[PDB]
Amino acid sequence: LMGGFGMKHPPPQILIKNTPVPADPPTAFNKDKLNSFITQYSTGQVSVEIEWELQKENSKRWNPEIQYTSNYYKSNNVEFAVNTEGVYSEPRPIGTRYLTRNL
Amino acid sequence: DGVGSSSGNWHCDSQWLGDRVITTSTRTWALPTYNNHLYKQISNSTSGGSSNDNAYFGYSTPWGYFDFNRFHCHFSPRDWQRLINNNWGFRPKRLNFKLFNIQVKEVTDNNGVKTIANNLTSTVQVFTDSDYQLPYVLGSAHEGCLPPFPADVFMIPQYGYLTLNDGSQAVGRSSFYCLEYFPSQMLRTGNNFQFSYEFENVPFHSSYAHSQSLDRLMNPLIDQYLYYLSKTINGSGQNQQTLKFSVAGPSNMAVQGRNYIPGPSYRQQRVSTTVTQNNNSEFAWPGASSWALNGRNSLMNPGPAMASHKEGEDRFFPLSGSLIFGKQGTGRDNVDADKVMITNEEEIKTTNPVATESYGQVATNHQSAQAQAQTGWVQNQGILPGMVWQDRDVYLQGPIWAKIPHTDGNFHPSPLMGGFGMKHPPPQILIKNTPVPADPPTAFNKDKLNSFITQYSTGQVSVEIEWELQKENSKRWNPEIQYTSNYYKSNNVEFAVNTEGVYSEPRPIGTRYLTRNL
Amino acid sequence: LMGGFGMKHPPPQILIKNTPVPADPPTAFNKDKLNSFITQYSTGQVSVEIEWELQKENSKRWNPEIQYTSNYYKSNNVEFAVNTEGVYSEPRPIGTRYLTRNL
Amino acid sequence: DGVGSSSGNWHCDSQWLGDRVITTSTRTWALPTYNNHLYKQISNSTSGGSSNDNAYFGYSTPWGYFDFNRFHCHFSPRDWQRLINNNWGFRPKRLNFKLFNIQVKEVTDNNGVKTIANNLTSTVQVFTDSDYQLPYVLGSAHEGCLPPFPADVFMIPQYGYLTLNDGSQAVGRSSFYCLEYFPSQMLRTGNNFQFSYEFENVPFHSSYAHSQSLDRLMNPLIDQYLYYLSKTINGSGQNQQTLKFSVAGPSNMAVQGRNYIPGPSYRQQRVSTTVTQNNNSEFAWPGASSWALNGRNSLMNPGPAMASHKEGEDRFFPLSGSLIFGKQGTGRDNVDADKVMITNEEEIKTTNPVATESYGQVATNHQSAQAQAQTGWVQNQGILPGMVWQDRDVYLQGPIWAKIPHTDGNFHPSPLMGGFGMKHPPPQILIKNTPVPADPPTAFNKDKLNSFITQYSTGQVSVEIEWELQKENSKRWNPEIQYTSNYYKSNNVEFAVNTEGVYSEPRPIGTRYLTRNL
């Protein structure tokens, strides 16, 4: 209902945890589980490569087709581009439907 | 390929193989010149008809088109009788279309008299749109069919297409299609045209009317093993409350468990052919069942297929639900009832609910010692699971196919009016006769030439459809009801020409006679 | 200077004339050329098929690129489409330069 | 490919083949972290400098880049002397670039003291842009070169790029390039990087200074066979008018017919190094030669290549025409004249007109018995046919190449500042050290991580260029003038390190000594 592509078997969930490393336990054996660990985190890079099939416009309509453009008026900042202080921003949502087709 | 030799032979027959039919129909046509070779926009504010509810913006083109989508084009009544009495269903497998013996004539009005004379050089250009790029106008059941009767010569309708509008103004998401921007074969006297088509696989139509009702699909001798709740009261008086369960037997039929339920219903108003029974008010537009889209108010003309008169009394019919055909020679407007053939669905009555009656009843409030039970009527019920419905009957005058609009979703895309819905129907065949300009001025002028030569063309069109069949296997004992000709001495043979030459069809002919079990 | 593609050998000129047919001359031989002809014209169709090579946009710029669209406001007539009386019209000129590229 | 083994060997040499040179230069670098791993926009209104004439809008990126486009990076002064004294011209054939022995260190400020410690896991990511998709910032002669002296360690400049602006605001035809959207190889200690490049074919540079002037390219012994108009007057007094023609001989040199003319000139203002001669007014910006583009007023810094002092008096120089280099240790602003090396073109004086002098003179009004002849000066003359010019000299501090902007047209695309213009120069090599975020908070927060670990990296860059050569064929008798070291006992060796370690270059070194005939 929200949108997108429903799938019986979507692309799976990818879960990640950093294995615990316990801080030095006590010398005498104790039954209880170890509640003391070492503050820890990890960092890396994730490549996500999707391949998209396409369907291309065959329409023979005469006149020009409406579609999406960038306003030309001198704005203070480039839309869909970083601010002065580094913040990235998206000015307005962008639908998928511009090209026209007959029922 | 010359002026002398003919470019094709008349072929009109129906050859009946056991498992399939092939119906060729060849007729002759005449194509005038529309819009003076212009494209124009038709928006209502140019033609009037000011209102919010009727608003359209669209273009009219000079092109003509062949529309054969009705059945009677392809089937003689005797081929129809032979079809629907012997068969449980049918589907078109293929289509072949030939257009030949084209001849282009040139009219001249001189000094008050008009003389027609051949034009051997001129061309008439044709194309079939196989990519479904243009709007599809065939599926709307407009007139302009091949005539029922192979003798009559007809005129070819004008192609025009509506688009988006806000009121009478175009949005600008609107499209303009220039029909002449397509690769159209053009041909002269001595050339012919043809193409072949193969219908995409669809379901067989149902030419059978069920032999047992849905509500009564059970053994009348044996009880079910399930217990309905029979009686909630011990007896009269205060504080008499019990729960008494009973077997659902033949003695009480309505209460047995049934694992299928009837099809959906969108209720219609009930209009009686007997006049004095109907109300004395203007309920035509006001009381009608409408579906609104984008602030427009549409009317519900054929709609979820559902029975009409409910059994005993046929004196009435749905206000806008039923297909309505005009008799031969019927006036244009404010036609009296008798002059119009009102189609009636009695055969769908077992599977589907009545058009004019509520779908059912539902409980509203929770009962309590204080609060009595209360139940409201269901005016509309969409598809549920385990719901069985039957499609609307298909007539001899009714449309064969329709184009299923290209969209993300559609449910049971069988056209509401009737016939065979198809993602890729048999294409539109458009025709125009190339313009020949009258003598231009000697000095070069920039403007386009607005002066042409009055011109039209004539020829023959062979439309050959191949129909797959499904044949009756039924083992029922007694005789089966089916379609016949009344024997009483009528003044004229029904489905035959009058004294003055007019061809006429007395009454509509449904497809459903043969019976089959649910 | 006006625009387009200058060529040493452009696509050639295609000239057409309909051969003269003289009206009936006089019986006695006369020296002078025939000044009397038959009013005449001809009609047909011309297919002009050009093949265009292309160069396609490789630009990696982030934000959206400005380009040409049809105004969406409810106009009386579709722009670049026929009028009510049949006249075809083009509302405004259309340049070739929208896509951007670095110097 | 491990922490222990080194990823490459220092290689710095110049091996001189007869027909070509190969100059390897290996130096060590340090890359800080710019902009806190942010992109930001630099538009002047954020940095001030309010005016219409200085206006810019652009982005600053964390990425650094290697700029080696100066010559002294690749050539020791002795390789330069050996180059320009023995050769009539040169062109780069190929380029090889290696980056190795990279090591990434992690700074920590604790309790007032800052401790540096290795980081073995961290990565520094690099990419060369071979498709010329990004803006090209190298060709503008910005500082940040590989240092002249192979010992010195340097810092790597920050990459930022201007775009379109209306005042301080972006138009929206402007572009934002996210440098990190490119497929950048990333590598750790134990990895190395390299690529090879092949310069596109360009013309040889001219390292020769002509041995005969353009105006004097003729036999001094022999007359021409053409007759100039010598004398238009019979003698003094009224109505004395004649046309007297004379041979153009050696006796009158200036009047002979010459079928080539000097190159174009865009005139410059004349500023004298001797101070008391110059005017007592602020002519710096007002009196300068400018080219306006889009309402901006640019200044003409190097421009059509043209001689400067005109022959006898070198006491002056063009206001903005001449390349101007700063001496080692030169202040930033309002530097005194002596502290700055003013480059002077005397070698181009034969082919090209003087920068500070008019191109010529042209007749204005038609003469008549009543109207005397009148001639105005030509302040600017663009290219004509049969015009010969010579390109600006190329120095040891000056830029090797520039990118010829991609456009529908360009004329003689040799850069005005100097060097070798190329449609596809050797690509930009950008480098950034991947960010390592400091410990995030435990509870998930939407916002991006603004806290990182102060970090930088270090390594070595081998830049190997292959130069094609053109060698002196001249048969002139006498000795040829060329470049030498003064012999007088100076306190310090020129082009050598000072007492305190500072490296310095005393004077600029042109490429033109060897002489060649027109």
PDB file of N, CA and C in Angstrom, chain A residues 55 58-66 97-98 100-103, chain B residues 133-135 173-178 181-182 403 405-408:
ATOM      1  N   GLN A  55      11.989  -0.451 -19.017  1.00  0.00           N
ATOM      2  CA  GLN A  55      10.996  -0.469 -20.076  1.00  0.00           C
ATOM      3  C   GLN A  55      10.932   0.933 -20.649  1.00  0.00           C
ATOM      4  N   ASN A  58       7.879   4.128 -25.890  1.00  0.00           N
ATOM      5  CA  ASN A  58       7.568   3.931 -27.293  1.00  0.00           C
ATOM      6  C   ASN A  58       6.575   4.957 -27.836  1.00  0.00           C
ATOM      7  N   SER A  59       6.143   5.913 -27.018  1.00  0.00           N
ATOM      8  CA  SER A  59       4.976   6.724 -27.342  1.00  0.00           C
ATOM      9  C   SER A  59       5.203   7.574 -28.580  1.00  0.00           C
ATOM     10  N   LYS A  60       4.204   7.598 -29.459  1.00  0.00           N
ATOM     11  CA  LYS A  60       4.229   8.391 -30.679  1.00  0.00           C
ATOM     12  C   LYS A  60       3.500   9.721 -30.579  1.00  0.00           C
ATOM     13  N   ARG A  61       3.117  10.163 -29.385  1.00  0.00           N
ATOM     14  CA  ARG A  61       2.413  11.433 -29.276  1.00  0.00           C
ATOM     15  C   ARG A  61       3.212  12.535 -29.950  1.00  0.00           C
ATOM     16  N   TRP A  62       2.502  13.528 -30.478  1.00  0.00           N
ATOM     17  CA  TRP A  62       3.162  14.590 -31.233  1.00  0.00           C
ATOM     18  C   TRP A  62       3.871  15.575 -30.313  1.00  0.00           C
ATOM     19  N   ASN A  63       3.111  16.317 -29.520  1.00  0.00           N
ATOM     20  CA  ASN A  63       3.584  17.494 -28.805  1.00  0.00           C
ATOM     21  C   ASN A  63       4.669  17.148 -27.786  1.00  0.00           C
ATOM     22  N   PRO A  64       5.249  18.120 -27.080  1.00  0.00           N
ATOM     23  CA  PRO A  64       6.276  17.780 -26.095  1.00  0.00           C
ATOM     24  C   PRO A  64       5.685  17.167 -24.838  1.00  0.00           C
ATOM     25  N   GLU A  65       6.438  16.250 -24.248  1.00  0.00           N
ATOM     26  CA  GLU A  65       6.032  15.556 -23.038  1.00  0.00           C
ATOM     27  C   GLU A  65       6.504  16.299 -21.798  1.00  0.00           C
ATOM     28  N   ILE A  66       5.624  16.390 -20.800  1.00  0.00           N
ATOM     29  CA  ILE A  66       5.983  17.026 -19.542  1.00  0.00           C
ATOM     30  C   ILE A  66       6.887  16.098 -18.744  1.00  0.00           C
ATOM     31  N   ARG A  97       5.937   9.512 -11.959  1.00  0.00           N
ATOM     32  CA  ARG A  97       4.995   9.556 -13.071  1.00  0.00           C
ATOM     33  C   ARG A  97       5.019  10.924 -13.725  1.00  0.00           C
ATOM     34  N   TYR A  98       5.597  10.977 -14.920  1.00  0.00           N
ATOM     35  CA  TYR A  98       5.580  12.145 -15.787  1.00  0.00           C
ATOM     36  C   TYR A  98       5.176  11.734 -17.194  1.00  0.00           C
ATOM     37  N   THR A 100       3.532  10.046 -20.290  1.00  0.00           N
ATOM     38  CA  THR A 100       2.126   9.714 -20.424  1.00  0.00           C
ATOM     39  C   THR A 100       1.942   8.531 -21.355  1.00  0.00           C
ATOM     40  N   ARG A 101       0.858   7.804 -21.128  1.00  0.00           N
ATOM     41  CA  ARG A 101       0.537   6.632 -21.911  1.00  0.00           C
ATOM     42  C   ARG A 101      -0.972   6.508 -21.949  1.00  0.00           C
ATOM     43  N   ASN A 102      -1.483   5.919 -23.016  1.00  0.00           N
ATOM     44  CA  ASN A 102      -2.920   5.777 -23.153  1.00  0.00           C
ATOM     45  C   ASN A 102      -3.412   4.621 -22.302  1.00  0.00           C
ATOM     46  N   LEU A 103      -4.658   4.719 -21.860  1.00  0.00           N
ATOM     47  CA  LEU A 103      -5.274   3.612 -21.152  1.00  0.00           C
ATOM     48  C   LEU A 103      -5.367   2.391 -22.058  1.00  0.00           C
TER      49      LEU A 103
ATOM     50  N   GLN B 133      -0.395   2.172 -30.106  1.00  0.00           N
ATOM     51  CA  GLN B 133       0.111   3.492 -29.771  1.00  0.00           C
ATOM     52  C   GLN B 133      -0.972   4.559 -29.775  1.00  0.00           C
ATOM     53  N   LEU B 134      -1.968   4.439 -30.642  1.00  0.00           N
ATOM     54  CA  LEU B 134      -3.060   5.393 -30.691  1.00  0.00           C
ATOM     55  C   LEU B 134      -4.082   5.080 -29.615  1.00  0.00           C
ATOM     56  N   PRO B 135      -4.993   6.010 -29.332  1.00  0.00           N
ATOM     57  CA  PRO B 135      -6.147   5.667 -28.505  1.00  0.00           C
ATOM     58  C   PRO B 135      -6.954   4.567 -29.164  1.00  0.00           C
ATOM     59  N   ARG B 173      -1.033  17.816 -19.618  1.00  0.00           N
ATOM     60  CA  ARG B 173      -0.704  16.403 -19.693  1.00  0.00           C
ATOM     61  C   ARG B 173      -1.415  15.746 -20.867  1.00  0.00           C
ATOM     62  N   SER B 174      -2.302  16.482 -21.535  1.00  0.00           N
ATOM     63  CA  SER B 174      -3.025  15.976 -22.686  1.00  0.00           C
ATOM     64  C   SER B 174      -2.064  15.655 -23.817  1.00  0.00           C
ATOM     65  N   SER B 175      -2.502  14.784 -24.708  1.00  0.00           N
ATOM     66  CA  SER B 175      -1.700  14.393 -25.850  1.00  0.00           C
ATOM     67  C   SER B 175      -2.426  14.750 -27.131  1.00  0.00           C
ATOM     68  N   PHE B 176      -1.657  15.115 -28.140  1.00  0.00           N
ATOM     69  CA  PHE B 176      -2.143  15.239 -29.499  1.00  0.00           C
ATOM     70  C   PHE B 176      -1.460  14.169 -30.326  1.00  0.00           C
ATOM     71  N   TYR B 177      -2.250  13.296 -30.929  1.00  0.00           N
ATOM     72  CA  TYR B 177      -1.737  12.301 -31.849  1.00  0.00           C
ATOM     73  C   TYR B 177      -2.037  12.760 -33.259  1.00  0.00           C
ATOM     74  N   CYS B 178      -1.010  12.832 -34.083  1.00  0.00           N
ATOM     75  CA  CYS B 178      -1.177  13.146 -35.490  1.00  0.00           C
ATOM     76  C   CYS B 178      -1.170  11.814 -36.210  1.00  0.00           C
ATOM     77  N   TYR B 181       1.406  10.500 -38.880  1.00  0.00           N
ATOM     78  CA  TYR B 181       2.786  10.351 -38.459  1.00  0.00           C
ATOM     79  C   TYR B 181       3.199   8.886 -38.351  1.00  0.00           C
ATOM     80  N   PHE B 182       2.368   7.965 -38.842  1.00  0.00           N
ATOM     81  CA  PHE B 182       2.516   6.521 -38.764  1.00  0.00           C
ATOM     82  C   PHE B 182       2.819   5.931 -40.134  1.00  0.00           C
ATOM     83  N   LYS B 403     -10.759  -3.610 -25.188  1.00  0.00           N
ATOM     84  CA  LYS B 403      -9.365  -3.525 -24.784  1.00  0.00           C
ATOM     85  C   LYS B 403      -9.296  -3.318 -23.284  1.00  0.00           C
ATOM     86  N   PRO B 405      -7.717  -1.851 -20.376  1.00  0.00           N
ATOM     87  CA  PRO B 405      -6.792  -0.722 -20.306  1.00  0.00           C
ATOM     88  C   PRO B 405      -5.480  -1.144 -19.673  1.00  0.00           C
ATOM     89  N   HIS B 406      -4.387  -0.581 -20.164  1.00  0.00           N
ATOM     90  CA  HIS B 406      -3.086  -0.970 -19.653  1.00  0.00           C
ATOM     91  C   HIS B 406      -2.860  -0.246 -18.338  1.00  0.00           C
ATOM     92  N   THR B 407      -2.776  -1.006 -17.253  1.00  0.00           N
ATOM     93  CA  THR B 407      -2.768  -0.460 -15.906  1.00  0.00           C
ATOM     94  C   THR B 407      -2.045  -1.439 -14.997  1.00  0.00           C
ATOM     95  N   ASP B 408      -1.689  -0.958 -13.805  1.00  0.00           N
ATOM     96  CA  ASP B 408      -1.012  -1.813 -12.839  1.00  0.00           C
ATOM     97  C   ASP B 408      -1.894  -2.954 -12.375  1.00  0.00           C
TER      98      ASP B 408
END
